[PDB]
RNA sequence: CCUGGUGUCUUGGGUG
């Protein structure tokens, strides 16, 4: 375990594959950093997974690296207002205001962190067939 | 939450510092007056007992 | 709370006519036909059939709003042919074509069975 | 003049090709088959005892989506056009469902086969639920545990799909034409080639491909339309087609009668 | 909660293909093969069974009030 | 019965950014210093390089509301191929032999460069162009 | 030349410097060196520059009225409680701010 | 309670979109129209019309709610069982429901400029959402993601005339802020009018008939087609000019093009007929000197408002019968331009390394007024910005004409060049407080880098794009930049509101008198002539 | 009117066979709040059936 | 799941919605204009992954910072009989004519927020007033009125409508008749109407 | 005293938008309270329509008292003000 | 047989 002060005098690696030097030219995938400023790096730590830097509401966003920061913030703020199944004993509880979805469905593009958030078991949404088009101008 | 209140200017305690890596969520934050102050811990965060 | 009734999309009121005809005095031999409690199904079927006629010079239809089940069609023929008789002949032709199609479909199903 | 060429036909779905017609006519026929076809679905749910974990309106909405046999629905009159008082035997079908699980262990799954037809316009074959075979339980409705009873009364009426989607006999009606794009009605979006990045339709072997040195026929019109009409079991495909044709003919006759009576 | 009766997109009756789907899954068959065996060529009907979450089993675990 | 008639040999054809609209440049054979840069369609009237086309510009097709052509009447368009109608939006009065006329057919642009003795009768409000062969 | 700081009175008297076109960004020193007529022009120029820096455009009448209201009593009147509430208007209007 | 109190006869709900309405029309629900009422005086020309509304009742629309005599006693129609024995006299008042052709005020908080309060005509519509035109969304600064707007109904006859002859929507077309209109054709309407005015656009007679019938101001005369043989085909320019009134001339030269127009640029409109020029944001947009301003200055407000609806309906029908969309492949480039982008990025990195080597060896030129570190940072930022601009320009030039993103960018309704640059080419350098990523750690920005690292990848230079994949460091930098921008916006909005409030409180008693002077409430002359003209 | 706040069925019209409660009875047109939807409708007097001690009695109740 | 919030503008039936070659109708229709400005390529990636998973038969792994690319998903989508970029030829639901431009089609995860229309609609003509100021109350559950702030007053002043602003704060608000003396100028005038 | 003669009026002879709106509102409010209409009423029975018809025919018996900042005023008749 | 009454102050999170 390391805190904010101990992280100042340590060298952490993003992925374990970066611990060893490789030997590409793919116009579809991302480009890894060159890191040609230092001759030889002496890594002392290694991150378990980068996707763990996010929180609870941010882990639900599918592929957050392909979005914008304001959009991600808006999604993380709106995720706390989605209708779904908050608890399994809603029939015996007398809350002031409760909203329960009819047919809760799990998303197709899920993340591994959801496996620890009980999202695939208690979802808050539906997989609807969406089309991107300009019909009779009633969707502008 | 940071007990600073809505009183103040600039953005010293509201901006996302570089030391917030792997400790708090860099995206989950309220909008309006509580933007930058109220934060949420990461998925692998821990508090000392 | 404010959602209109669904059965009103096909039920005609007692004080509202189904088919209204109004004359167009701006151009000779032109009529405006207002259809109530209808959709694009009969509208396009009548529009294309009227456009496929040589005596019809102009035929068009439009729905003012999808929330209301009604539309308006403009029909302007020549001096010799009346648009009402042309619409009646088009309706009769579509009826005969549908009857022939149903007969052929039944004859084909009797063999496929 | 219009010719019909049935490609495949069975009990539920039927795939055929319509020729010597018009595009607007095929669109109108599809819209009539998808909406303007009267069927028979549950319209009223009287609940006298419901101690299950589901809501009453939930069970009512689940029952409203149950397809019923409407083979003899043409002779059935509408509820809003009946001159009698309240529900009778000429405009409403009555069914009852009583379920109760006895035992401290287990779960009784109430299926659609428990819907017992009480009354109806005899001897018309209407009101019975749709079944695949003879041992199929049907659509799942609810699950009862210990000391959980469900007694419900279903009243089904005649209606079209314009009022509610539960009266729609057809589910997915596929319709296409011109697999080789001879009319140039669309612009294929491509990155390098449009003939390799776009897959071929399932009816590409039924029509000849255009010649590379063939001139553009500006007088060409859509003639052949391949249509696959599927049903949900409440009605047959040929019956649905015939009823849609009859509804279109009745609408045309009503329009022609109004035109002749307007004078 | 419970398996829907009709498809949200088209409207195919998919409420009677849950027990057979679970039985096919118990035999070691994959999800795609189990969906193809039930004559579900359209993805709109496959998403109603593959992405379905049965929650009535957890609600039935509670003791009845009456 | 016509205002101008000539035979132009197509020299350059540029498709441009559109796949159906192409700009063709032609020069008359019987007289020089007469150019014709016209936008035409490809799917309705395909042209090629070094092609002779008879171009006839007139003011009326008779030998205001549009109507479908009846199969019993005749006009000037019954003996031509590519028939178009448009409005002249420029009448440049240059230096004698240099006279440019700009016509627009719903967007299709035509620039005709010629003298005075051949284009003095083209000062009209509307123009019908007929291209044969 | 662009000189940091404000000192128009001593810069204008420097030989070889055009003592008729020297402009200052601070209108406070302009009001003391030149006058109120030049202060109005300097304020209008500054406001127009601030408006047009981001590509926006505002009509001349609005900025003219804005710079004429502040330059009406002879001195620079701020848009705060010190210059607005120090007028001869009614008490009910001054107490509403 | 005095400078800002609560008034009656006011409704508030979320608005919606409805291009099938007029410019000065608003869709009022049935329940809202039944709750709100207007007191009409019983005259000798509408007593028979008011008797029907009285007999209808407050539960049936159209109907009445209250009857007031000359003394002030109100008759409640909800409990009055003897409604059939009520005769109306001359001089009474009847509170009738909100019917059609009723000018009502419409607003949305906050109300910045004077165009925020507009008088619209009530149209009874179902549901519980306000139906507004898709052209008044620019002055309202509203969208359809949860915009609650306020509607007020006048309670007198003078207020109705004032709202109809002053705060009318067609009267608020040209704004005095920059002598330019504030409402124009945008969004999907602009995207459709950009494609309909193309040179290779041909429509058949069957569709041309329906498109001409969709014009309420159509004279009933079909225009002649551009091509007569071998098939009658019309052009979108003619069908667009049909809705344009006659007697309208507009000449706009773009890029110094000639009359032949090789790039199909410019704009020529003679006698209300568009000769050439693709209609986009520089024609029917909100800019000054366009077609909207020309029509407003020539014809009037009514014709200008009708032209908006005509163009909207025509373009909407054309787009519904045509179609437009977007996909992932619209943001993916070929394998030839990605290599050039990577080579440009490598050249920029090499230039940055050379600048670092020159600065660390006392071989860098010192900028006038800046130190070594400041000049170095400025040069690095300028080089990175130039490299990003070059990559974006290359990615945009790689796009074809059939690309939907390029079409939406050239239309001007939505998107720009930086959007394409960040989606296809490179994101760019993340700036924080005007500078780059500050060293939040010990001589570094992140623990995954070494100390004293001035490389672009260690200071907030997102090399990858949104399609490729942002690295965790680049993702954190982008999140920091977005958070800083959001905080700056949320802090500056209150300052701008306070500045506007102070300016309003300072300038509120100014009024131009009849003598041409501009004086306040005390009578002191601020300007001898308004605007010095 | 001794018919206020009473369970009433519908025998004719569109909503043929629906339970409702007489919320307001001003005259002829009775205001009935139905049980299936969440709305109150005006209905003529000859379109209702009031309950009693045996079945639904019409206007003779 | 990407910040693309939206309200329902209109509701279409089954026969009015567009359909592709297989007869699949969209459950929802969004605007393309909300794609290039907001830069939501992640939405398209998620839609493509969901379509691929629904065609094959598994849930795609949307974990960030992985080796999942776009071409690898496009290849699997093309190997199933569909287009590589997810484009499908959709038809018009009104006339049946083909669309010249293809339409993006596929499943996407959506959620319903707590903000609705029935929970925000409010209207009041003459309701209960306060006791201290005799003004309309504040609150939706108390049948209150809308607030006419200072910005609305300034906008009405800029419009030039003085009568409307005078009536909005008098007849349509909390007017009251007071009696003043012609000498003292105060409101300490004892008045009796029934005794005059 | 404070009244300016008709031969020394220096105000504008055209009717502004505010004055026109006020005149129309006053005429509509007067007609709504049973007032003798000076023109003929055909199909248009709305008070605002009758007021607009009376203004278009220049038959409104009203006089605008334009006030001056010094305290004086000018009375301009509606039958002489040129309306665009 | 008309007339008719449920509220002041705060704390935390959201909407445009
Ligand atoms: Mg908004
Ligand atoms: Zn019956
Ligand atoms: Zn389906
Ligand atoms: Zn006194």
From TrEMBL, chain C:
GO terms for molecular function: DNA binding; DNA-directed RNA polymerase activity; protein dimerization activity; RNA-directed RNA polymerase activity. SUPFAM superfamilies: RBP11-like subunits of RNA polymerase (SSF55257). GO terms for cellular component: RNA polymerase II, core complex. Pfam families: RNA_pol_L_2. The keyword Transferase does not apply. Keywords: DNA-directed RNA polymerase, Nucleus, Transcription. Residues 30-102 form the DNA-directed RNA polymerase RBP11-like dimerisation domain. It is found in: Nucleus. InterPro entries: RBP11, RBP11-like, RBP11-like_dimer, RNA_pol_Rpb11_13-16kDa_CS, Rpo11-like. Its main location: nucleus. Belongs to the archaeal Rpo11/eukaryotic RPB11/RPC19 RNA polymerase subunit family. This is RNA polymerase II subunit B12.5. It comes from Komagataella phaffii (strain GS115 / ATCC 20864) (Yeast).
Automatic annotation (TrEMBL), chain E:
Its main location: nucleus. GO terms for molecular function: DNA binding; DNA-directed RNA polymerase activity; zinc ion binding. The keyword Hydrolase does not apply. It comes from Komagataella phaffii (strain GS115 / ATCC 20864). Gene3D superfamilies: Homeodomain-like. It is found in: Nucleus. Belongs to the archaeal Rpo10/eukaryotic RPB10 RNA polymerase subunit family. GO terms for biological process: transcription by RNA polymerase I; transcription by RNA polymerase II; tRNA transcription by RNA polymerase III. It comes from the Eukaryota. GO terms for cellular component: RNA polymerase I complex; RNA polymerase II, core complex; RNA polymerase III complex. This is DNA-directed RNA polymerases I, II, and III subunit RPABC5.
TrEMBL record, chain J:
Zn(2+) 1 binds at residues 181, 184. Zn(2+) 2 binds at residue 184. It is found in: Nucleus. Belongs to the RNA polymerase beta chain family. Component of the RNA polymerase II (Pol II) complex consisting of 12 subunits. DNA-dependent RNA polymerase catalyzes the transcription of DNA into RNA using the four ribonucleoside triphosphates as substrates. This is DNA-directed RNA polymerase subunit beta. It comes from Komagataella phaffii (strain GS115 / ATCC 20864). The lineage of its organism: Eukaryota, Fungi, Dikarya, Ascomycota, Saccharomycotina.
UniProtKB/TrEMBL annotation, chain K:
GO terms for molecular function: DNA binding; DNA-directed RNA polymerase activity. GO terms for cellular component: RNA polymerase I complex; RNA polymerase II, core complex; RNA polymerase III complex. Keywords: DNA-directed RNA polymerase, Nucleus, Phosphoprotein, Transcription. One of its GO terms (biological process) is tRNA transcription by RNA polymerase III. Its main location: nucleus. It is found in: Nucleus. Belongs to the archaeal Rpo6/eukaryotic RPB6 RNA polymerase subunit family. This is DNA-directed RNA polymerases I, II, and III subunit RPABC2.
């Amino acid at each position: 375990y390391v805190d904010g002060e101990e992280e100042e005098t340590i060298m952490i690696a993003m992925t374990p594959e970066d611990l060893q030097t490789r030997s590409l030219n793919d116009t579809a995938k991302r480009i890894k950093p060159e890191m040609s400023t230092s001759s030889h790096h002496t890594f002392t730590h290694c991150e378990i997974h980068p996707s763990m830097i996010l929180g609870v509401a941010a882990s639900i966003i599918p592929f957050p690296d392909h979005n914008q920061s304001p959009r991600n913030t808006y999604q993380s703020a709106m995720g706390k207002q989605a209708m779904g199944v908050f608890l399994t004993n809603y029939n015996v509880r007398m809350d002031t205001m409760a909203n329960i979805l009819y047919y809760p469905q799990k998303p197709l593009a899920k993340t591994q962190a959801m496996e620890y958030l009980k999202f695939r078991e208690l979802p808050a949404g539906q997989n609807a067939i969406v089309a991107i088009a300009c019909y009779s101008g009633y969707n502008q | 939450n940071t007990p600073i209140g809505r009183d103040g200017k600039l953005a010293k305690p509201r901006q996302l510092h570089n030391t917030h890596w792997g400790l708090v969520c860099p995206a989950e934050t309220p909008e309006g007056q509580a933007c930058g102050l109220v934060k949420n811990l990461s998925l692998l965060s821990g508090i000392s007992i | 709370m404010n959602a209109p009734d669904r059965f009103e999309l096909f039920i005609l009121p007692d004080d509202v006519p189904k088919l209204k005809i109004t004359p167009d005095s701006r151009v000779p031999n032109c009529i405006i036909i207002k259809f109530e409690r209808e959709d694009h199904t009969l509208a396009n079927l009548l529009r294309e059939e009227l456009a496929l006629y040589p005596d019809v010079t102009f035929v068009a239809y439009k729905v003012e709003h999808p929330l209301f089940a009604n539309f308006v069609m403009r029909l302007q023929t020549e001096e010799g042919t009346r648009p009402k008789q042309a619409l009646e002949r088009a309706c009769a032709s579509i009826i005969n074509k549908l009857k022939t199609l149903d007969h052929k479909f039944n004859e084909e199903w009797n063999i496929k069975n | 003049e219009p010719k019909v060429n049935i490609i495949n036909a069975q009990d539920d779905e039927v795939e055929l090709m319509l020729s010597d017609v018009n595009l607007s006519l095929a669109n109108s026929l599809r819209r009539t088959m998808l909406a303007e076809v009267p069927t028979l679905a549950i319209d009223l749910v009287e609940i006298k005892m419901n101690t299950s974990v589901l809501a009453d309106e939930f069970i009512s909405h689940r029952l409203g989506l149950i397809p019923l046999v409407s083979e003899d629905v043409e002779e059935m009159k509408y509820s809003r056009d009946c001159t009698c008082e309240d529900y009778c035997d000429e405009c409403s079908v009555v069914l009852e469902l009583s379920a109760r699980h006895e035992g401290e262990e287990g779960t009784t799954d109430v299926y659609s086969s428990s819907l017992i037809k009480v009354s109806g316009p005899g001897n018309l074959n209407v009101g019975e639920p749709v079944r695949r075979d003879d041992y199929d339980q049907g659509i799942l409705l609810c699950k009862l545990r210990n000391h959980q009873e469900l007694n419900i009364r279903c009243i089904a009426k005649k209606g079209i799909a314009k009022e509610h989607a539960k009266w729609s006999p057809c589910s997915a009606i596929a319709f296409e034409y011109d697999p080789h794009n001879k009319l140039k009605h669309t612009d294929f979006w491509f990155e390098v080639d449009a003939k390799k990045e776009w897959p071929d339709s399932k009816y590409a072997t039924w029509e000849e491909p255009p010649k590379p040195g063939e001139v553009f026929d500006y007088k060409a019109k859509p003639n052949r339309f391949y249509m696959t009409v599927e049903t949900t079991g409440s009605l047959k495909a040929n019956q649905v087609f015939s009823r849609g044709i009859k509804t279109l003919q009745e609408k045309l006759a009503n329009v022609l009668f109004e035109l002749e009576n307007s004078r | 909660m419970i398996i829907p009766v009709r498809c949200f997109s088209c409207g195919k009756v998919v409420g009677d293909k849950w027990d057979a789907y679970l039985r096919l899954l118990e035999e070691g068959k994959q999800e795609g093969d189990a969906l193809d065996e039930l004559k579900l060529k359209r993805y709109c009907c496959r998403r109603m069974v593959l992405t379905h979450v049965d929650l009535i089993e957890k609600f039935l675990r509670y003791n009845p009030l009456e | 019965s016509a205002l101008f008639d000539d035979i132009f040999t197509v020299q350059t054809v540029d498709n441009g950014r559109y796949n159906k609209v192409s700009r063709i440049i032609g020069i008359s054979t019987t007289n020089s210093a007469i150019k014709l840069t016209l936008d035409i369609n490809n799917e309705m009237f395909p042209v090629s390089q070094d092609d002779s086309l008879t171009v006839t510009l007139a003011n009326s097709l008779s030998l205001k509301s549009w109507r479908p052509p009846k199969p019993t009447d005749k006009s000037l368009a019954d003996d031509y191929d590519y028939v178009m109608f448009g409005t002249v939006y420029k009448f440049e009065e240059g230096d004698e032999d240099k006279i440019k006329v700009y016509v627009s057919f719903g967007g299709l642009l035509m620039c005709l460069e010629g003298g005075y003795k051949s284009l003095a009768s083209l000062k009209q409000d509307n123009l019908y162009i007929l291209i044969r062969r | 030349l662009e000189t940091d700081g404000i000192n128009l009175a001593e810069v204008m008297a420097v030989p070889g410097v055009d003592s008729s076109r020297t402009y200052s960004n601070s209108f406070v020193e302009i009001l003391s060196v030149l006058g109120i007529e030049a202060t109005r022009s300097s304020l209008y120029k500054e406001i127009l520059n601030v408006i047009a820096f981001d590509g926006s455009y505002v009509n001349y009448r609005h900025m003219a009225l804005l710079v004429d209201v502040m330059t009406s009593r002879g001195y620079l009147m701020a848009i705060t409680r010190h210059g607005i509430n120090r007028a001869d208007t009614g008490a009910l209007m001054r107490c509403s701010f | 309670n005095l400078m800002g109190k609560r008034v009656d006869f006011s409704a508030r709900t979320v608005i919606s979109g409805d291009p099938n309405l007029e410019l000065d029309q608003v869709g009022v629900p049935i329940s809202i129209a039944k709750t709100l009422s207007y007191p009409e005086t019983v005259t000798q020309y509408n007593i028979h019309r008011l008797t029907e509304y009285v007999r209808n009742g407050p539960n049936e629309h159209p109907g009445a709610k209250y009857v007031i005599r000359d003394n002030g006693d109100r008759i409640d129609l909800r409990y009055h069982k003897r409604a059939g024995d009520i005769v109306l006299q001359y001089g009474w008042k009847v509170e009738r429901h909100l019917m059609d052709d009723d000018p009502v005020l419409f607003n949305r908080q906050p109300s910045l400029h004077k165009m925020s309060m507009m008088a619209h005509r009530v149209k009874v519509m179902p549901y519980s959402t306000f139906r507004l035109n898709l052209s008044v969304t620019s002055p309202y600064n509203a969208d359809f993601d949860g915009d609650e707007m306020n509607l007020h109904v006048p309670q007198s006859e003078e207020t109705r005339a004032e709202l109809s002859q002053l705060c009318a929507v067609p009267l608020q077309i040209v704004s005095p802020q920059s002598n330019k209109p504030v409402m124009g054709i945008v969004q999907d309407t602009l995207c459709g009018v950009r494609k309909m005015t193309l040179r290779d656009t041909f429509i058949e007679y069957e569709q041309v008939m329906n498109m001409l019938f969709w014009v309420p101001s159509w004279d009933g005369v079909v225009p002649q087609p551009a091509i007569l043989k071998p098939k009658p085909l019309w052009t979108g320019k003619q069908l667009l000019s049909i809705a344009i009134p006659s007697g309208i001339h507009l000449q706009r030269t773009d890029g110094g093009n000639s009359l032949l127009s090789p790039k199909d640029n410019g704009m020529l409109i003679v006698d209300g007929k568009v000769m050439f020029g693709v209609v986009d944001k520089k024609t029917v947009g909100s800019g000054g000197g366009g077609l909207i301003h020309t029509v407003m200055r020539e014809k009037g407000p009514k014709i200008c408002a009708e032209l908006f609806g005509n163009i909207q309906k025509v373009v909407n029908y054309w787009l519904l019968h045509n179609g437009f969309s977007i996909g992932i492949g619209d943001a993916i480039a070929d394998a030839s331009t990605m290599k050039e982008i990577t080579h440009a990025i490598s050249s920029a990195k090499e230039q940055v390394q050379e600048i670092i080597y020159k600065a660390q060896h006392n071989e860098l030129e010192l900028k006038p007024g800046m130190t070594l570190r400041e000049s170095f940072e400025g040069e690095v930022s300028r080089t990175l910005n130039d490299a990003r601009d070059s990559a974006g320009r290359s990615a945009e030039m790689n796009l074809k004409d059939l690309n939907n993103v390029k079409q939406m960018v050239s239309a001007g309704s939505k998107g720009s060049f930086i959007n394409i640059a960040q989606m296809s080419a490179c994101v760019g350098q993340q700036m924080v407080e005007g500078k780059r990523i500050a060293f939040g750690f010990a001589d570094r920005s992140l623990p995954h880098f070494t100390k004293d690292d001035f490389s672009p990848e260690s200071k907030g230079f997102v090399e990858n794009s949104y399609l490729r994949g942002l690295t965790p460091q680049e993702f954190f930098f982008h999140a920091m930049a977005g958070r800083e921008g959001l905080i700056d916006t949320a802090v500056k909005t209150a300052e701008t509101g306070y500045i506007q409030r102070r300016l309003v409180k300072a300038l509120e008693d100014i009024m131009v008198h009849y003598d041409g002077t501009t004086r306040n409430s005390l009578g002191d002359i601020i300007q001898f002539l308004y605007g010095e003209d | 009117d001794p018919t206020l706040n009473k369970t009433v069925k519908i025998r004719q019209g569109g909503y043929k066979g629906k339970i409702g409660i007489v919320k307001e009875a001003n005259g002829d047109r009775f205001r009935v709040e139905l049980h299936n939807p969440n709305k109150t409708i005006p209905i003529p007097c000859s379109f209702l059936l009031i309950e009693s001690t045996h079945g639904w009695v019409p206007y003779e109740d | 799941r990407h910040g693309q919030k939206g309200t329902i503008g209109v509701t279409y039936r089954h026969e009015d919605m567009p359909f592709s070659a297989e007869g699949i109708v969209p459950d929802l229709i969004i605007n393309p204009h909300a794609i290039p400005s907001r830069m939501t390529v992640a939405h398209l990636i998620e839609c493509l992954l969901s379509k691929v998973g629904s065609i094959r038969g598994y849930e795609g792994d949307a974990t960030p910072f992985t080796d999942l690319t776009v071409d690898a998903v496009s290849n699997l989508l093309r190997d199933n009989g569909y287009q590589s970029r997810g484009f499908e030829v959709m038809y018009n639901g009104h006339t049946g004519k083909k669309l010249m431009a293809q339409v993006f089609f596929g499943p996407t995860y959506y959620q319903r927020l707590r903000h609705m229309v029935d929970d925000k609609i409010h209207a009041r003509a003459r309701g209960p007033v306060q006791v201290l100021t005799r003004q309309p109350v504040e609150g939706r559950s108390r049948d209150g009125g809308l607030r006419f702030g200072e910005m609305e007053r300034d906008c009405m002043i800029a419009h030039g409508a003085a009568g409307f602003l005078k009536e909005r704060l008098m007849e349509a608000s909390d007017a009251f008749r007071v009696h003043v003396c012609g000498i003292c100028g105060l409101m300490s005038v004892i008045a009796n109407l029934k005794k005059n | 005293e404070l009244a300016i003669l008709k031969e020394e009026r220096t105000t504008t002879p055209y009717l502004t938008k505010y004055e026109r709106a006020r005149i129309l509102g006053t005429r509509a409010l007067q007609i709504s309270m049973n007032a003798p209409v000076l023109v003929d009423i055909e199909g248009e029975t709305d008070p605002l329509q009758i007021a607009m018809k009376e203004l278009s025919q220049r038959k409104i018996p009203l006089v605008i008292r334009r006030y001056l900042p010094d305290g004086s005023y000018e009375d301009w008749g509606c039958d002489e003000l040129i309306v665009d």
